[PDB]
Write a protein that holds these residues in place. Structure first.
Motif, short mmCIF file in Angstrom:
data_model
loop_
_atom_site.label_atom_id
_atom_site.label_comp_id
_atom_site.label_asym_id
_atom_site.label_seq_id
_atom_site.Cartn_x
_atom_site.Cartn_y
_atom_site.Cartn_z
N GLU A 154 4.82 7.93 -5.66
CA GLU A 154 5.37 6.80 -4.92
C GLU A 154 5.29 7.00 -3.41
OE1 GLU A 154 9.42 5.99 -6.02
OE2 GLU A 154 9.38 3.92 -5.31
N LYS A 176 1.85 6.06 -2.00
CA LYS A 176 1.78 4.61 -2.03
C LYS A 176 2.47 4.05 -0.80
CE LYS A 176 1.47 3.48 -6.98
NZ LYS A 176 1.95 4.71 -7.66
N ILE A 177 3.74 4.42 -0.62
CA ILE A 177 4.54 3.93 0.49
C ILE A 177 3.87 4.24 1.83
CG2 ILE A 177 6.74 4.09 1.69
CD1 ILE A 177 7.97 4.81 -1.09
N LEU A 232 0.73 1.96 2.27
CA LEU A 232 1.12 0.57 2.46
C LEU A 232 1.74 0.33 3.83
CD1 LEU A 232 2.55 -0.39 -1.05
CD2 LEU A 232 0.33 -0.94 -0.04
N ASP A 233 2.56 1.28 4.28
CA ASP A 233 3.23 1.15 5.57
C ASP A 233 2.25 1.43 6.71
OD1 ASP A 233 5.61 0.39 4.39
OD2 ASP A 233 6.54 2.37 4.49
N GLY A 242 -0.72 0.33 6.70
CA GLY A 242 -1.39 -0.94 6.90
C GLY A 242 -2.25 -1.41 5.74
N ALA A 243 -2.22 -0.67 4.64
CA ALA A 243 -2.96 -1.10 3.45
C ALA A 243 -2.30 -2.32 2.83
CB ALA A 243 -3.08 0.02 2.45
N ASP A 244 -3.09 -3.10 2.10
CA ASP A 244 -2.59 -4.34 1.52
C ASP A 244 -2.33 -4.18 0.03
OD1 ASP A 244 -3.15 -6.81 3.66
OD2 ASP A 244 -4.47 -5.07 3.93
N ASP A 245 -2.99 -3.19 -0.56
CA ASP A 245 -2.84 -2.91 -1.98
C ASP A 245 -3.19 -1.45 -2.27
OD1 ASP A 245 -2.27 -3.36 -4.66
OD2 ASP A 245 -3.39 -5.24 -4.73
N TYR A 246 -2.75 -0.98 -3.43
CA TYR A 246 -2.90 0.42 -3.81
C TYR A 246 -3.04 0.55 -5.32
CZ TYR A 246 -1.81 5.48 -3.73
OH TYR A 246 -1.84 6.85 -3.86
N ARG A 258 -7.44 -8.29 -7.86
CA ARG A 258 -6.81 -7.95 -6.59
C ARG A 258 -7.72 -8.18 -5.37
NH1 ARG A 258 -1.90 -5.59 -7.27
NH2 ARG A 258 -1.35 -5.00 -9.42
#
Lengths: 224, 223
Positions: free
Chosen positions: B85, B88-89, B92-93, B95-99, B112
């Motif tokens: 997790e 992932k966090i 995403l933080d 600047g990614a839009d999906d994982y 996706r």
DNA sequence: CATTTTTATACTTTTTTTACACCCCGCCCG
DNA sequence: CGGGCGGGGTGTAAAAAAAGTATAAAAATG
């Protein structure tokens, strides 16, 4: 500044989990127990984001997404207890923006919420104010009136440690230990000159300081 | 019309599989095997989407994402072996839009991708000061009506400064965002390139009123 | 070859040192 | 008696010394 999140969920344990996650990241929560109520409130309350549980019994959530998408472009995050790929594909193709499969943690959900929300959104820096002086700590920029005033690094560290301790008295030793460092916790000669500079630049009457107050014999305290 | 996708992936099998799969669904596919090359290709090819494998051994994926985010808003979809997790966090933080965690189904990935594309589909926000106009998203700087050429470092520095407009950045953070974490010692680099930026952009480089020095601290872009 | 990194030197700001005025008080001094 | 005479702790203003900055130009990088 509050993000409005509408949760469409009938189960109490899950609604509790979501409410914890959303309130844990500074968002207001609207609730709907049925898909129909969900659509109604999606219209009437204009949420910034919708979290939809596909495990709602009163109907098909994918058709909810298709109905919603006929008049709204609000971000939809879909939750499911299933793991089937065709469900993901169908929901995303219906117009959902994200899809979470059990098990999911609070952290990841919050992150995906931020991701979904940051697309439809700056937020100016918080100022500290006293008299006609304005201090932007993060930006390291100080104003007085409409003109910027220039602080040297030590002047700024001093000002900062004072601002973060408004009203409270500081011993010369701790001021020294927080501005200069341990090596000069006895050099009580510097602060008079430097507080003299702060007073000179910021105070309307440097002779009679209203904000930079000296606690005779023991140290200093700042007001406002 | 036809979507351009840039894949930043070191493993050959994955590159071939993804190329076949994505070209099959009507996308034009570009590939990079390293992060630096990936960045260069993002800059020149202007992809509609980027697929990034965090398993690249030549550097830090999060760093790629941040650097890219200094000027581009292109959708980034991250692939990873780890399913923790925290990663992932972090992604995403960053600047990614999906994982997605490997292994994944190709169907989910494609859905996706479709989401990311159909969403990001108004003109670029310009930054104007003096007689200079900056379009970060198109990586183009104009002075008057003539284009000004910035070198990769100069542009990166400019982008960081403009993204933190009005705020003073310390030498350490400028160095860290422009050269990387292993150059946080070399302040002279920063002085030199700030010199270049001033020469190319300021009216009077000797007395700048837009690229300001914060002595003992760092630098700052105003207006 | 464009670009980055190393190299060298003149320069500006900031910190520190060094000097001396003060002001509210108490009590040693006309 | 009761006013000048000092001594902590403190405020300003200059200097001298550190520290940090601007710029050119050559060597290295790929």
């Amino acid at each position: 500044a509050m993000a409005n999140v509408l949760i469409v969920e009938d189960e109490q344990a899950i609604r509790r989990f979501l409410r914890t996650a959303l309130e844990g990241d500074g968002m207001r929560v609207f609730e709907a127990e049925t898909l129909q109520r969900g659509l109604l409130e999606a219209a009437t309350r204009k949420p910034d984001l919708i979290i939809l549980d596909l495990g709602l019994p009163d109907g098909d959530g994918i058709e909810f997404i298709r109905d919603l998408r006929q008049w709204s472009a609000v971000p939809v995050i879909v939750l499911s207890a299933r793991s089937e790929e065709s469900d993901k594909i169908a929901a995303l193709d219906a117009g959902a923006d994200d899809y979470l499969s059990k098990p999911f943690g609070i952290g990841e959900l919050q992150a995906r919420l931020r991701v979904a929300l940051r697309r439809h959104s700056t937020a100016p820096d918080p100022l500290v104010k006293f008299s006609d002086v304005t201090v932007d700590l993060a930006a390291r920029v100080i104003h007085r009136g409409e003109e910027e005033v220039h602080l040297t690094p030590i002047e700024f560290r001093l000002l900062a440690v004072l601002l973060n301790n408004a009203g409270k008295v500081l011993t010369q030793r701790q001021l020294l230990n927080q501005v200069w460092g341990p090596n000069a916790v006895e050099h009580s000669h510097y602060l008079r000159i430097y507080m003299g500079h702060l007073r000179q630049k910021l105070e309307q009457d440097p002779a009679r300081p209203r904000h930079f107050i000296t606690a005779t014999g023991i140290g200093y305290r700042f007001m406002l």
